[PDB]
Amino acid sequence: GRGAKRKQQDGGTTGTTKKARSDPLFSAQRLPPHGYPLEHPFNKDGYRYILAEPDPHAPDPEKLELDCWAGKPIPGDLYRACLYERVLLALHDRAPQLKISDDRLTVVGEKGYSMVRASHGVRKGAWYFEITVDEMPPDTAARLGWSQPLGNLQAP
DNA sequence: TCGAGAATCCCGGTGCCGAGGCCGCTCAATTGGTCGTAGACAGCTCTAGCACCGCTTAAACGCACGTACGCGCTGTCCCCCGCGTTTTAACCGCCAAGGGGATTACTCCCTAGTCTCCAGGCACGTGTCAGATATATACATCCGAT
């Protein structure tokens, strides 16, 4: 009856394993260390993992004690890790090697190549915006421009 | 080859007394001469470790072998320990004291040092016997016979 936790820890057989790998310097995210609005950019380019907008699930996996998420999930009212009005870049489709401020204004890269994408599309209207390059040390490429989510977040 | 339970590591999260650094106030470490001297240089004397060889034999060399036991294996059985319990004084922190350990001051007396002469203990002969050396023997022991 205690094998369910081991199955959940090893990885199970539900597709991708339950053992995250984001080994570059990942910061500016994953603030609340509990079951709340969270995010995990993954090593594998193209993995977006988020917990905001929660959901219940079916209880009683292996006739253990009744889980609290049976029909009445626990509530949550705290920090949510995203932005609505105009996403300053993003917090979901990113690489786990980018350092951003708490207010999400500055972007600091890794020892190697890195990028940040956004989460807002443009179809009509004026979007005359700016990227103020605070500083650029030698051997630090600073190419900027629009791209697509299909783009590999670590590819040049 | 795989779980349940059981432990340890670490992330906070917080409160506290020990290493630290500054100020103030000493006491012994230099500096410079000064004075006596211990050892360094060169010479000469003597004596023995070394190179050398001769001849003799006690002992090392190496084979032969027959068995004593070191070792692997078995079985055995018994008691050390881990788990649990009840049981209790080491440890903590608090009191109070008197006594004696460390410090001050002092007078006094034991001793380093000098000078003094004489006597006894090591270098050096010299006579002499205690025990090693080789011979013959009663005896206790390993081995072999029953």
Swiss-Prot record:
Resulting phenotype, residue 2 to K: Abolishes methylation
Compartments, as annotated in UniProt: Nucleus
Post-translational modification: Both monomethylated and dimethylated on arginine residues in the C-terminus. Arg-2 is the major site. Methylation is not required for nuclear localization, nor for MLL complex integrity or maintenance of global histone H3K4me3 levels.
Modified residues (Phosphoserine): 22
Tissue: Ubiquitously expressed. Predominantly expressed in adult heart and testis and fetal lung and liver, with barely detectable expression in adult lung, liver, kidney, prostate, and peripheral leukocytes.
Domain of life: Eukaryota
Asymmetric dimethylarginine: residues bearing it: 2
Role according to the record: Transcriptional regulator. Component or associated component of some histone methyltransferase complexes which regulates transcription through recruitment of those complexes to gene promoters. Component of the Set1/Ash2 histone methyltransferase (HMT) complex, a complex that specifically methylates 'Lys-4' of histone H3, but not if the neighboring 'Lys-9' residue is already methylated. As part of the MLL1/MLL complex it is involved in methylation and dimethylation at 'Lys-4' of histone H3. May play a role in hematopoiesis.
Subunit structure: Interacts with HCFC1. Core component of several methyltransferase-containing complexes including MLL1/MLL, MLL2/3 (also named ASCOM complex) and MLL4/WBP7.
Protein name: Set1/Ash2 histone methyltransferase complex subunit ASH2
Parent sequence residues shown: 295 to 450 of 628
